Amino acid sequence: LVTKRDGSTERINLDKIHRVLDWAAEGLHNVSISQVELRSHIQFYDGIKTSDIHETIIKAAADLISRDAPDYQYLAARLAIFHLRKKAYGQFEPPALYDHVVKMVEMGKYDNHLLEDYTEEEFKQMDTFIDHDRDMTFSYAAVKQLEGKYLVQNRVTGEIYESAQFLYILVAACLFSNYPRETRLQYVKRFYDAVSTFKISLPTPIMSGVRTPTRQFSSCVLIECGDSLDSINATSSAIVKYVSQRAGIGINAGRIRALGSPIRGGEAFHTGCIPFYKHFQTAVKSCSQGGVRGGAATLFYPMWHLEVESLLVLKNNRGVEGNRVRHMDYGVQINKLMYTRLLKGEDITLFSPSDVPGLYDAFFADQEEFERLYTKYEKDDSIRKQRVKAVELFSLMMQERASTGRIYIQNVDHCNTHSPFDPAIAPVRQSNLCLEIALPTKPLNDVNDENGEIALCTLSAFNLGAINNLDELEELAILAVRALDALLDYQDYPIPAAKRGAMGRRTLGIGVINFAYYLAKHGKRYSDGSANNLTHKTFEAIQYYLLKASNELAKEQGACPWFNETTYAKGILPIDTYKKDLDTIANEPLHYDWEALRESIKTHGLRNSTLSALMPSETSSQISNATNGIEPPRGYVSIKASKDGILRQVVPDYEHLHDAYELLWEMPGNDGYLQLVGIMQKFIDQSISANTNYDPSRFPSGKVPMQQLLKDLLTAYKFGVKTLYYQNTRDG
Amino acid sequence: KYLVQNRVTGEIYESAQFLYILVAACLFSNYPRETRLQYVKRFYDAVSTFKISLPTPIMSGVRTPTRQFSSCVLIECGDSLDSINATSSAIVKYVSQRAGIGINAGRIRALGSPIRGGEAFHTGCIPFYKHFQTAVKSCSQGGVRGGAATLF
Numbered sequence A: 001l002v003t004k005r006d007g008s009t010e011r012i013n014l015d016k017i018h019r020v021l022d023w024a025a026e027g028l029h030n031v032s033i034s035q036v037e038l039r040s041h042i043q044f045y046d047g048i049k050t051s052d053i054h055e056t057i058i059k060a061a062a063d064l065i066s067r068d069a070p071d072y073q074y075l076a077a078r079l080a081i082f083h084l085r086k087k088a089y090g091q092f093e094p095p096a097l098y099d100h101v102v103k104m105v106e107m108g109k110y111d112n113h114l115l116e117d118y119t120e121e122e123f124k125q126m127d128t129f130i131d132h133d134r135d136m137t138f139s140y141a142a143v144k145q146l147e148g149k150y151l152v153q154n155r156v157t158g159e160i161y162e163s164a165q166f167l168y169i170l171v172a173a174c175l176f177s178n179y180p181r182e183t184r185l186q187y188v189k190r191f192y193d194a195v196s197t198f199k200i201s202l203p204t205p206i207m208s209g210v211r212t213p214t215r216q217f218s219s220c221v222l223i224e225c226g227d228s229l230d231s232i233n234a235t236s237s238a239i240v241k242y243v244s245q246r247a248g249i250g251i252n253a254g255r256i257r258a259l260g261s262p263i264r265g266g267e268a269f270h271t272g273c274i275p276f277y278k279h280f281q282t283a284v285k286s287c288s289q290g291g292v293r294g295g296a297a298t299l300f301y302p303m304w305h306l307e308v309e310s311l312l313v314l315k316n317n318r319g320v321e322g323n324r325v326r327h328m329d330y331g332v333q334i335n336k337l338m339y340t341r342l343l344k345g346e347d348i349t350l351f352s353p354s355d356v357p358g359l360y361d362a363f364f365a366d367q368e369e370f371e372r373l374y375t376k377y378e379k380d381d382s383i384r385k386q387r388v389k390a391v392e393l394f395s396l397m398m399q400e401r402a403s404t405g406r407i408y409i410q411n412v413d414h415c416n417t418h419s420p421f422d423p424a425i426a427p428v429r430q431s432n433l434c435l436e437i438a439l440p441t442k443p444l445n446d447v448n449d450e451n452g453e454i455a456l457c458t459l460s461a462f463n464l465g466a467i468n469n470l471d472e473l474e475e476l477a478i479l480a481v482r483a484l485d486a487l488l489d490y491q492d493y494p495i496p497a498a499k500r501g502a503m504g505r506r507t508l509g510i511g512v513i514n515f516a517y518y519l520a521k522h523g524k525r526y527s528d529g530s531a532n533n534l535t536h537k538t539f540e541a542i543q544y545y546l547l548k549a550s551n552e553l554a555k556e557q558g559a560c561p562w563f564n565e566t567t568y569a570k571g572i573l574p575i576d577t578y579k580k581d582l583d584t585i586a587n588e589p590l591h592y593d594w595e596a597l598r599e600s601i602k603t604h605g606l607r608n609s610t611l612s613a614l615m616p617s618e619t620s621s622q623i624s625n626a627t628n629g630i631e632p633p634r635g636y637v638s639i640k641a642s643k644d645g646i647l648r649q650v651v652p653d654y655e656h657l658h659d660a661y662e663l664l665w666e667m668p669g670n671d672g673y674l675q676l677v678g679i680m681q682k683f684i685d686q687s688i689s690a691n692t693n694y695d696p697s698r699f700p701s702g703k704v705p706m707q708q709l710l711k712d713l714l715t716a717y718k719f720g721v722k723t724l725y726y727q728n729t730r731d732g
Numbered sequence B: 001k002y003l004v005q006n007r008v009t010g011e012i013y014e015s016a017q018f019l020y021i022l023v024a025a026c027l028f029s030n031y032p033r034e035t036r037l038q039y040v041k042r043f044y045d046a047v048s049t050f051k052i053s054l055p056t057p058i059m060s061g062v063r064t065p066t067r068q069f070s071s072c073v074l075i076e077c078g079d080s081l082d083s084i085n086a087t088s089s090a091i092v093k094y095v096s097q098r099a100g101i102g103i104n105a106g107r108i109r110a111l112g113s114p115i116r117g118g119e120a121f122h123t124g125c126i127p128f129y130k131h132f133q134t135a136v137k138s139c140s141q142g143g144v145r146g147g148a149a150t151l152f
Ligand SMILES: Nc1ncnc2c1ncn2[C@H]1C[C@H](O)[C@@H](COP(=O)(O)OP(=O)(O)OP(=O)(O)O)O1
Pocket: A002, A003, A004, A005, A010, A011, A012, A013, A014, A016, A017, A020, A050, A051, A053, A054, A057, A086
C-alpha cells in the first residue's frame, strides 16, 4: 500500500520515483541514480507514506556527497527544496506573493505592518522580481540550514510555511518600507536580488526574524561592569534579559576590585572575583536545558590584575569547583609593556584595580601615561602588589589557552591607537563573543540607567566569490550599509544603555565570506604570503566603498549624533594609525581616492561610526556554499551533525580548484595566516576573529613547544593584529 | 563579634557594660527627655542582667556608623525575566550585609511551559535557581562560607 499526502492509498509506481530523481540529475556529472536508489536501502512496507519517501531519498542522495562526486550537493538540495515546496503549498508551484503575505498575516506568522505599508498592487509588482528558480542554486548543506532555522515554520508540529525566495523579498520589504515610494520598490528589488544570488550575507537572527511579530534581532552584546554591588546587580540582570533572546555576551568585569581589597574603609574586605564571575555564568546559562547548551559569553580582564593567576585557570577541567567557572570563555587583555617585560626576561607586577588610580583608564587611553603610573606604583611600597616572572605568567596563559582553547588575547593598545573612536572620549575596553567587535561602552548603575551604553551587533558579510571586480563593491556597499542602518530603527531596545549606543554611534559589523575560494581563484595561498598585496588592494576597496556608502547616507539623513567622538570627524583615517611595521610585508599602493573621501566625510560625516569588522560565519557561509570568513577550509568536504542527520558540504567549485585550495593542515605554520590577518586589520575598523592552528605531527615527540606559542603571539602584535580567537589543536 | 574592635590589628575598644547602655541610648534617644533616661536605665539593666536577649546584628551595631541591622530576608519572585532579575539583584545587596535569604520562586512556570505563545518554551527552574545560589554566595570566601538561604 502507498500513502499519499491527502492520505488516499495507492499502489507503488516506482517509475514515479525514478523520474523525480532523474529530473534532479539533469546537468550533473558523476552522479548515479542507482547509488541513491540502492544506497537508500529504502524499505517498503504495506502502507508507507509517500512523504517518508522524500526523507529517505533526500538523505540517501546526501550520503553520496563526496569530492569525487560534488554534484550530489545540488541533486539532493533540489530534492529537498521540492519536499519543502510541496510540504508548504501542496505543490511545487509557489502561490502569488500577495496571497502568500495575506494567508501568513492571518496565521499571525508575518507582521501585519506589511499589508499596511504596501498596497496589493505593489505586492503583485514585487512578485515579478522574484525568481523561484534560484532555489535550485542552493547546496544541500545550505538547504538544511534554511529548513531547520531560516524558513518560518511550526516548531511543534513541524509544518513549514514559506520558501527561500519569499524570505528574501520580505526581509528587504520590511527593511526598506520607510523609503520614499519613488525608490522604495527600486531598493526592494536591488536588495532581494543581491541576497538571493548570494552576493550579500546576513546574520541568522535577521534572516529568521524581520517580517515576523518578533523584534529581537541582536545576536551578541558587550556589557561593562563597574566596581559596585549595584553595577554587578545590573550587569547580571542585563545578560539574563539578553541571553533569553539567544544573544551572546561579552562581559568586562576588569573594574571589580581584587580579593582582600578594603570595603567601606575597614568595615569589610573584598570576597573575590570568582564569587561574582560564577553568578555571571549562571546568568549566561539562565536559559538552557540543564544549563548544558546555549548561553555563550567571553569575559575580559587586564593581564596585570591581582587575581590574574586564579582567573587564568578558571576554564581548566581539573581543579576545585570552588575556584572554577568553566562554561564562560575569557579574553586576557595585553599591551606593549607586558610583551616587553617578557622579551627582557624581567618580572611583572599585579595590582588591584582599586589600588592604582588612573591605571585602568590609561591602560586603554594612553600607553605612555600607563607606563608612568605603572612604574611609579611599582616602587611605591605602600601599594599592594605581587611580582611574577614574565616568562612564567605568559606560559600559564598559553598553557590554559592550549588546554581549553577558549582563552583569547586582546591587545588593548591596538584597539585604541588604530580605531575609529577617540580613546579619550569613548575607548574600546572589551570585545564580543566573536571577539571581532571593538566598540566603546559605559557601565550601568542599574537596568534602566540612561547614562549607560551597550554595544550591539547588526552584522553582515560580502561574498568575495560573488563579485567579478572590486568596483562591484560600490553597489553592494550601498545595499548593505543602507539595509543595516535601517534595522537599527526597526528592532527594539529592552535596555536603555543598549539603545543609547545604537542611536548614538550607529555601528555596524561587516565582514566577508568565501575568502578561501577567493584567494584560490586568483591562484593565491596563505602561508607563502603571495596574497599579501592582493589582500591590501582587495580590502582597500571593501572599506573605501563602505566609507563612501555611509557618507552618502549621512548627506541624505544626517550623520550619527556622537560622530564628534570619532577620529573620523577629526580627519584621521585608518591608513594613518595602522602599525608602521605593516610596510615591510606589502608594497601594494592605494588604488582609491582616499583624499576625495577625506573631505566628503569631513563635511557630511558618517551615518555609522564603524562599518568593517571581521567575524566568523558558520550559518551565513553555508547558505552561500561559501567558505567560512577568511579562515581556510580544513578539508574539501566538511561534516556536521543536524537533527535530521549528517551534513556534508564541499568547497565551492572543487571540480576545477581542487589543486588551488590550501587545506588548514597543509600549512607549514601560522606565519602566512598572521600576515594576511595583519594586512586586513589595517582596513577593518573593528577587529578580526583569527584562530591559532597547530599540528603536533610537525613537532618533535609530538609536543608543541612554548617557544613557538610565544614566537607567533609576538608576530601577531607586530603586525597590528587586534584579537586572537580559538586555538585548534588537530587530533590525528 | 559583639564588642567594638579593630578586625585587622586585633585591638578591642569597649567593654560589655558600655555596649548595653549605649544600645539603649540610641534606641530611645528620641523619647521625651523626662521619659528618656527612665527607659535608658530600665532597658540597660534588663539586657545586662540577661533578662532580655537581642539579635547579634543589633548588639554589634547600634551605636556605630553602620546602619545595616536586618539579619534575615524574605523575597517573593514572580514568573518573569524582570521579576527574577530583581529578586537576584536584591539578595545580592542584602547578603553583602550578611543577611539570610528566604526565596519564594514558586511562581516561576515549569519546564516546557510555552513562552510568548509559541515563540519559545520554558528552559526550567534549575537554571534560575542556580543563579539565585550564586547570588547568595556572591560574597563568600571561595563561595563556601556565608550566604545562607531557604527556597520554597
Ligand atoms: N503511489 C506511489 N507509487 C509509487 N511511488 C510513490 C507513490 N506515491 C509517492 N511516491 C514516491 C515517489 C516520489 O519520490 C514521492 C512522491 O511524493 P510527491 O511526488 O512529492 O507527492 P505525491 O506522491 O503526492 O504526488 P505528486 O507527484 O503529484 O506530488 O514518493
